[model samples]
Target: GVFNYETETTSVIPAARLFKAFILDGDNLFPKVAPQAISSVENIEGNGGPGTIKKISFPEGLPFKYVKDRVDEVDHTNFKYNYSVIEGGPIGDTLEKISNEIKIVATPDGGSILKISNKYHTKGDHEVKAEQVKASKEMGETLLRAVESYLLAHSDAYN
Candidate 1:
């Protein structure tokens, strides 16, 4: 069965700045802010564009060894991004593939609302638990918050 989950958070940061820092330069910024959770992010294949394959690694003793995500689409004009997890630990164990898309929208309050949608494709005839999905959603939210906090602390960043 396939399941969909979403999480969104609004921040005082500007949309373009957040998109530039978190979405465009995430490979560099993520590890700096959350070194414990993410060891490194590297481009395993292709340039930093659509069809690029990125490998995300966690610290030792983490649950997942690494996740390889393929960039499906990236529309800088619209502030939209999409990717699919092609391989990993729990990603391979319980899911066939997880599709993720992010959209950043500007607000009148000089802030942005970051919306993330995740589509979980489970193996045939296998049912996924709600708790598991909830955990995944929480992880995404945590990462968003971490990036937001980091950008806030470093005000001059991504401008």
Candidate 2:
């Protein structure tokens, strides 16, 4: 059976703001926030944000590069956002793509909590590695902080 688990973190900004930063502008914001990892996300068609497919390639030459289509599920009334890669990405091309999910929930502390947990079926049937998971979480937090700092300085740009 596939592993089941969830990792979450809370941010300082309000849920609506955080959602916009992480979800609405994710394509552009992610690469800008974490240029070290994500090189560039060139949108193929449609808008620059969610539901659009983009070519995800790394500047420093990552292991894989492909296109990803993301769809956003936002509960505006509740100030929450959720999304997932629907097709044509590195993970989607390489793996069987059983499942991958991300969720952002509003916290009572006037902030938002990001939660990500994925389960997929891959070929070759090998032992699962933990480094990717660890790195992903660390990078995620780093991105959050980067956005936090930038948001503080340029309040009008992001909104």
Candidate 3:
């Protein structure tokens, strides 16, 4: 029961900058930047390596109130991280879990290139639809676009 959604986006912001903003403080800043969509991230126990469970909450009038992600790997050396959604969101009748793997690599201009994947594991008998998957692709870009716009605007926010 697996489905894949992958994309690459390049930015003028460097890899470490992007990693700090998009990965390191994502839980903290995302809620600040996109409060209506993500209210807060909960229960971040310990230094946050493998096996840490992060519960995320959204405001009212959303499809899912909460979604929890289990950290699988965090490669700070290479600016990459991976996690899986095991206990919330669309895990009811159609999905078993959704895993995401992401990377930020340095570009020639000290900028960054992001490689991201969202893997959906479904129930044994349930199949995901195309439109659903199609919609999934742009979601990452939208989040990144907002974050990138914020960083570019502040100038020294994530330096």
Candidate 4:
């Protein structure tokens, strides 16, 4: 498989609570912040959690496309989560198989450092590759920013 795209984003959050809100509660958090692209997050089977499958729909091109499969690897001890989309999406050609990981490292100042990464195997088309990478990075940043703001406002949530 040819690697098509890879991007990373790092930011600081108050605590693990923020990390959960961004990654675990992302289905609800993302749409609120980036509604232009993330219209909704639908959990199809089980819980909207690890080993669960969810659908992510957008507003254009392919309205409301599903992620088909969403299985996550959670490392509670280290505040880390990794997941991948296995099927059902408009950008299937470019995102046939995708993996994303989010890790929250404790900051020396009692805050948390968020590290996010996405790796994908895209088809051999430069244009598709460009769009896929752009979209992924944009979404990643949006998610981080949203989480940070949410945490800052609800300081009580941090213990």
Candidate 5:
């Protein structure tokens, strides 16, 4: 089975600025904001562009191993990011893979809107729990909020 989910958030930060923080500087900023959830992120293969394999490690005592996310596409002009988690404990015995697409666009005001899409591929006859999906969405939003707060406090950042 395949499932798709989307979440949108509005921020006072510019699209390009936010995109830089979300994509280019993610490996540098994420661990600072959500240290418990993400121990570290490093590129294991390929350039920072498409095909780059980013190894995201969690803290010890986590249920599963790290997740290797393969960058599929990145467009700076359009502020789009596409990637897939090809290996991880999240893909345990049931899941096939998880794909994510992020798009940032300028809004009428000075703020920007971030839209994230998540596609889940499940093994045959497998049904993902509603709470599982809900938790994932909540976690993503929480991370975004953490970043937003950080940027807001440092106003001069990511310009």
Candidate 6:
């Protein structure tokens, strides 16, 4: 089964600043700010464009340790980013891969809105349970707040 999920969030950080720091330079910045979630992100293939593959490893874990995502689309001017998890993490069993499309738009109050889309690809009609989605959403929410809080405290970051 191919499941889809969508969510929206507003951030006090400006669109350009948030997009630049989170979408463009996230690999370098996320680990520095949110060490609890991501330990490291390395570009194992391609540059920083289409088809780029980045391996994201977490701190020592019980089982789920890392995820390798293939960059599909990155629109700097449009503030849009897309990537697909090709291997590792939850892809070890019944799932084939997971895809994400994220967009950021500027708000009149000098802030931004994040529109996130997700797709889950299951292996041969395999079903994805609801509880996992909810859990992952919670995890993602934490990362977003971590980055937002970092930016709020350090205005010069990702300028």
Q: Per-residue lDDT tens digits of candidate 6, residues 1-159?
A: 788998888888889888888888888877888887888999999988989999999888624688899999999889999999889988868999899999998989898888988899998878887876776676667777888989889888777
Overlapping backbone residue pairs in candidate 2 total 1
Instruction: Please write out the lDDT profile of model 1 over residues 102-134, one tens digit for every residue.
Output: 999999989999888988899777877777777
**Estimated TM-score for each candidate:** 0.91, 0.73, 0.87, 0.77, 0.90, 0.92
Candidate 5 contains a number of clashing pairs equal to 0
| Number of the candidate with higher lDDT, 2 or 5 | 5
Considering only N, C-alpha and C atoms within 3 Å, which residue pairs clash in candidate 6?
none
Residue pairs of candidate 4 with colliding backbone atoms:
none
lDDT of 2 at 75: 59
Q: Single out the weakest 10-residue window by summed lDDT for candidate 4.
A: 1-10
Q: If the candidates were sorted by their lDDT against the true structure, best first, what order would they fall in?
A: 6, 1, 5, 3, 4, 2
lDDT agreement with native, every candidate: 0.84, 0.63, 0.81, 0.68, 0.83, 0.86
Among residues 3 or more apart in sequence or in different chains, the pairs in candidate 2 whose N, CA or C atoms overlap within 3 Å are 67-88
Model 1 ranges off by over 4 Å: none
Candidate 4 lDDT, tens digit per residue, 1-159?
A: 545354445566655676668766777877887676677878887675578877777767544355565768767678788888787664454446778777777778876666666666666753344665676677677767876777777787444
Reference-based lDDT, residue 98, model 3: 84
After TM-score superposition, the amount by which residue 95's alpha carbon in candidate 2 deviates from its true location, in angstroms, is: 2.8
Q: Which consecutive 10 residues in model 2 have the weakest lDDT in total?
A: 89-98
| Top-lDDT structure, candidate number | 6
- RMSD (Å) per prediction: 1.6, 3.4, 1.9, 3.2, 1.7, 1.5
Clashing pairs in 1: none
Give the lDDT of residue 110 in candidate 6.
90
Clashes of each: 0, 1, 0, 0, 0, 0
Q: Quote the positional error of residue 38 for candidate 4 in Å.
A: 1.8
Ranking by TM-score: 6, 1, 5, 3, 4, 2
